[PDB]
Symmetry: C3
Subunit: 213 residues, 3 copies
């Protein structure tokens, strides 16, 4: 897209895993981001699921410029505009709607929107998108669905998210249609509480190393 200098494909090809981040306490955002980056995971999906999320995006953008920071759980144009102004470099949505797709394609940052079904994929493709989130992946029919959902759509590429962990992420990464996966396991809620940044860095390092096929 001539409106998106940073392509959706570039976001998804940066690394094999995109952490789904829920940050309950702002003060933890920056050291969490540094811990991820130290472990080799740079694309951070900061979800709009807590009050401090947008402030977390602004903080990480300023203090951790090697992190590629984006907003998740973006549901509508208002939230998309808010995170764009706050410095999000991309947006992820759990599903798609026409107002959100229209706003995204009119704006400056890539949206990688979730789909569950081929009709939803077709709607996103009608807006010119070719990279999608597959969410919730396990609930959608999993790897077998992508071998099938992605079938008639040889050119479309995905980031599956939802019920993915070290036990199964390789099953997804093995697919030609999959560029990367997402999951919350890299930033456990209690690790942030405990200031266990070492644990976060280790999970990141393990996830990247464990991804080599």
């Amino acid at each position: 897209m001539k409106n998106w200098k940073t392509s959706a494909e570039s976001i998804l090809t940066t690394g094999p895993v995109v952490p789904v981040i829920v940050v309950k306490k702002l003060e933890h955002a920056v050291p969490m981001a540094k811990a991820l980056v130290a472990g080799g995971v740079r694309v951070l999906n900061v979800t709009l699921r807590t009050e401090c999320a947008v402030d977390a995006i602004r903080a990480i953008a300023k203090e951790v410029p090697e992190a590629i920071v984006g907003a998740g759980t973006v549901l509508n144009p208002q939230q998309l505009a808010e995170v764009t102004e706050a410095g999000a470099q991309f947006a992820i949505s759990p599903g798609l709607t026409e107002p959100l797709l229209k706003a995204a394609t009119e704006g400056t940052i890539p949206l990688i929107p979730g789909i569950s079904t081929v009709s939803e994929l077709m709607l996103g493709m009608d807006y010119g998108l070719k990279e999608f989130k597959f969410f919730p992946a396990e609930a959608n029919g999993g790897v077998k669905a992508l071998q099938a959902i992605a079938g008639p759509f040889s050119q479309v590429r995905f980031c599956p998210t939802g019920g993915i962990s070290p036990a199964n992420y390789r099953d997804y990464l093995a697919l030609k249609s999959v560029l990367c996966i997402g999951g919350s396991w890299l930033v456990p809620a209690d690790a942030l509480e405990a200031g266990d940044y070492d644990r976060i860095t280790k999970l990141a390092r393990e996830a990247v190393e464990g991804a080599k096929l």
Copy 2:
């Protein structure tokens, strides 16, 4: 919009179970509704799956003031207007479309529409809705799928329906995202056919009591 004197949330919080009613003979409708009310179940989803359904809603609306009667399997604005005219206090649909969402939100009674995917949830939220049916619940991936679908959406609430029975309804009621559940087991076709209203009352009371804890 302000348009609904009865909120969707009030329909879903009246009690833990909403019977999915399929009534083939009109003469059965009023005694069936009375039998449910006697068992403590008083939100009655009369599905538009039989010729007599709208007449059944009309009769129950007039004769059983201790029940709140509504219509289910409402597919389109034509049906919505019919059940509104007949005295339905709410409408349930198995999925959603924009013409149905527009007509409902512009109209006088709450619509609780089914969804299966997050995109469908988001389209409903674009029309201001926050209470949905999760249908067909077991075919949508059950409790786990519902937990994943509901996760990015802390505020949304559900009524799962489809494949729910005493064997599994507590699993759904245990979830923070669930207000009540729907099921056809409270009004079995053979009970209606045999005029066993006593058994309907017992099924209703068993359901209500079994929902506690």
Copy 3:
């Protein structure tokens, strides 16, 4: 029925129990493959828009094998629908649906049997007057159980499930009241097609038709 369609979508699905999902890589294979399928008793040919020669294959089959009911699959938008209609497709199948595709289809001249996975998608198709749908991808959608539940509140709709259907499971679907036929790729194996092994294609079609009987 749809005022602009000379052929009903229902008639497409009631032609036979099995609709082959065809991926044709080289044009010269298209006509003999079509004749081989017809000779095995299978004549509704879903030529998917997954290869460069697909549209020319539809045109060739429409010309040389007019006794086949040839159509186009993997139709994703109004442009592709118009293109296949001009080529001689007698119907169109899509893996999913969108409002622009539904609108173009109902204004156009050939039946569209579009894929759905959820009841909201079914309801959108129904808003356009459609009653015949594909259920895709069937097995990953949750198979016969899913289809049973989804089809429940919808007694008049009929389906063609496609996606993971095989001789192992197709009778499971064909036994359902809501199912008229199924789609499958096993009748036209890629290697048979490239090898020009047409007797094998005929045998597989004949076996599929006989095995469909309940």
